[PDB]
Design an enzyme around this catalytic site. Structure first.
Site, PDB file in Angstrom:
ATOM      1  N   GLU A 179      75.076  27.328 163.514  1.00  0.00           N
ATOM      2  CA  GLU A 179      75.394  28.548 164.265  1.00  0.00           C
ATOM      3  C   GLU A 179      76.822  28.526 164.789  1.00  0.00           C
ATOM      4  O   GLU A 179      77.362  27.468 165.125  1.00  0.00           O
ATOM      5  CB  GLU A 179      74.433  28.683 165.454  1.00  0.00           C
ATOM      6  CG  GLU A 179      74.487  30.057 166.184  1.00  0.00           C
ATOM      7  CD  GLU A 179      73.972  31.210 165.321  1.00  0.00           C
ATOM      8  OE1 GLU A 179      74.637  31.564 164.319  1.00  0.00           O
ATOM      9  OE2 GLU A 179      72.880  31.754 165.647  1.00  0.00           O
ATOM     10  N   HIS A 223      76.963  29.490 159.749  1.00  0.00           N
ATOM     11  CA  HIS A 223      75.961  30.547 159.607  1.00  0.00           C
ATOM     12  C   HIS A 223      76.614  31.837 160.092  1.00  0.00           C
ATOM     13  O   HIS A 223      76.491  32.236 161.255  1.00  0.00           O
ATOM     14  CB  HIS A 223      74.707  30.158 160.394  1.00  0.00           C
ATOM     15  CG  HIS A 223      73.632  31.204 160.422  1.00  0.00           C
ATOM     16  ND1 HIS A 223      72.694  31.353 159.422  1.00  0.00           N
ATOM     17  CD2 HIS A 223      73.315  32.115 161.373  1.00  0.00           C
ATOM     18  CE1 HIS A 223      71.859  32.330 159.747  1.00  0.00           C
ATOM     19  NE2 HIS A 223      72.228  32.821 160.914  1.00  0.00           N
ATOM     20  N   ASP A 259      76.306  37.402 163.132  1.00  0.00           N
ATOM     21  CA  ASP A 259      75.679  38.728 162.973  1.00  0.00           C
ATOM     22  C   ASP A 259      76.677  39.835 163.373  1.00  0.00           C
ATOM     23  O   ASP A 259      77.878  39.567 163.586  1.00  0.00           O
ATOM     24  CB  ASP A 259      74.405  38.800 163.840  1.00  0.00           C
ATOM     25  CG  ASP A 259      74.677  38.595 165.340  1.00  0.00           C
ATOM     26  OD1 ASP A 259      75.787  38.155 165.724  1.00  0.00           O
ATOM     27  OD2 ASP A 259      73.774  38.891 166.145  1.00  0.00           O
ATOM     28  N   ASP A 282      75.436  20.374 157.433  1.00  0.00           N
ATOM     29  CA  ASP A 282      76.370  21.445 157.020  1.00  0.00           C
ATOM     30  C   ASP A 282      75.721  22.377 156.005  1.00  0.00           C
ATOM     31  O   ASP A 282      76.230  22.566 154.885  1.00  0.00           O
ATOM     32  CB  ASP A 282      77.726  20.925 156.484  1.00  0.00           C
ATOM     33  CG  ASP A 282      78.760  22.031 156.351  1.00  0.00           C
ATOM     34  OD1 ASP A 282      78.602  23.086 157.021  1.00  0.00           O
ATOM     35  OD2 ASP A 282      79.730  21.841 155.578  1.00  0.00           O
TER      36      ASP A 282
END
Ligand code: CA
Ligand code: NA
Length: 435
Positions: A411, A358, A57, A402
């Site tokens: 993550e 991610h 993020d 994956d």
């Protein structure tokens, strides 16, 4: 089995570089990254550019950012010879200079410290490049009316560890870090509270369970930095000799300060709890092992928890605390992550590494192509390789799909790599031994 630790260190440092926010240097080594979040500022317009994006993020979450920095600094101090052998020592200094500079900016006045930039909900609603963000990025601080002893003392610990790291190369910078560390720690002591109650946007993401352990940790770091008795007094005031840590992580500093005080300060009262932690992690303890050999503490970031435990074990071993079993344990965990169970869990490294972390920026195709939630959902590899990222990890049966949307296992985060990187440097240092 054997692994190229020099390459692992190089890549772990590149992961942190790929997490940089702000005005990127001309020598930026991450070609898909550019200037981003140049508008980040405090509520009186104070410059808050820089720092690291926390995970996949674009929020700047000050608590894990500080803890990751304290942990990286500690590994640089203890395992400098490993970093140097790898040719990665000055790159490691440059790595954490980035966040230390951000903490200086965030400390806008003696008793105001900015702890977050970005609203986690609006940030996480966007999928795309940080360079292309258009949403409002609020900034929140702690202060006497909205305290955060945990955040302030963790940042003080990072700054004091930073002083110790940098006084050997840039003494003026180092001594400025130390001055701010002292001030932030005084603020932490004077104004008691949980930072994620004061900055409640953090509470769904990096909720702090207690601040007393950060008070002990900050005091232990400032004692190492200054040798002033009052800091040792504070460490005894807030530190426990009777409780054993569950983890070493961004929330729980207990075994960190116990080990720091035993080794750097020679305070053997904390030693039994260090041994309890280690033996809980070693085979036959309380931490379950997967069939292929990962010490699996919990579903979220088991690689992170094990790498953090391996880091604590390697610091322990360096100071001749259960060194044989600690080195064996730490090597088993790091080597699990590097490929012993059949694949690397480090993006862009080794055999069959994860290709779908991610992670927003590495998920986006080359400029000038668009990037949105299609890039979250697309079934193929991330378009960019996020070199060095340690993913969350497998389930308790060593399974890993994956998949980008598997946000638990796939993550990546600043804190995931922080113990890991120091542990790798420690294992590199052990290779320097005679024989
Ligand atoms: Ca805590
Ligand atoms: Na730039």
């Amino acid at each position: 089995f054997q692994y190229n630790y020099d390459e692992v260190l190089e890549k772990s440092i590149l992961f942190y570089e790929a997490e940089r926010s702000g005005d990127l240097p001309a020598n930026n080594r991450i070609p898909y990254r550019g200037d981003s979040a140049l508008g980040d500022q405090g509520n009186q317009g104070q410059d808050l550019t820089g720092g690291w994006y926390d995970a996949g993020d674009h929020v700047k979450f000050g608590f894990p950012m500080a803890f990751a920095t304290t942990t990286l600094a500690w590994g640089i101090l203890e395992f400098r010879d490993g970093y140097e052998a790898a040719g990665q020592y000055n790159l490691a200094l440059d790595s954490i200079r980035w966040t230390l500079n951000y903490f200086l900016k965030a400390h806008v006045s003696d008793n105001e410290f900015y702890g977050q930039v970005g609203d986690a909900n609006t940030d996480h609603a966007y999928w795309g490049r940080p360079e292309d963000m258009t949403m409002e990025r609020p900034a929140w601080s702690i202060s006497p009316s909205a305290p955060g002893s945990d955040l302030a003392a963790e940042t003080a610990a990072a700054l004091a560890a930073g002083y110790l790291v940098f006084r050997d190369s840039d003494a003026a910078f180092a001594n400025n870090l130390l001055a701010h560390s002292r001030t932030l720690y005084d603020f932490a002591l004077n104004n008691r509270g949980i930072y994620s109650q004061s900055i409640s946007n953090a509470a769904g993401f990096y909720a702090s369970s207690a601040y007393e352990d950060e008070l002990a940790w900050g005091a232990a770091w400032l004692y190492r930095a200054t040798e002033e008795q009052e800091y040792l007094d504070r460490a005894y005031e807030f530190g426990t000799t009777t409780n054993t840590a569950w983890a070493y992580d961004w929330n729980e500093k207990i075994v960190g300060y116990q080990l720091l005080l035993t080794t750097s300060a020679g305070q053997t009262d904390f030693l039994p709890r260090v041994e309890n932690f280690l033996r809980n992690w070693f085979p036959g303890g309380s931490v379950q092992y997967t069939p292929l050999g990962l010490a699996w503490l919990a579903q979220w970031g088991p690689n992170r928890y094990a790498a953090n435990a391996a880091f604590i074990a390697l610091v322990s071993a360096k100071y001749n605390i259960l060194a044989s079993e600690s080195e064996q344990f730490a090597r088993s965990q790091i080597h699990y992550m590097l490929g012993d169970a059949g694949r690397s869990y480090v993006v862009g490294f080794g055999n069959n590494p994860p290709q779908q972390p991610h992670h927003r920026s590495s998920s986006c195709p080359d400029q000038p192509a668009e990037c949105d939630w299609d890039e979250f959902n697309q079934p193929g590899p991330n378009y960019q390789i996020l070199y060095g990222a340690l993913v969350g990890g497998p389930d308790q049966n060593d399974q890993f799909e994956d998949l980008r949307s598997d946000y638990i296992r796939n993550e990546v985060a600043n804190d995931y790599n922080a113990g890991f990187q120091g542990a790798v440097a420690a294992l590199r240092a052990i290779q320097l031994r005679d024989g």
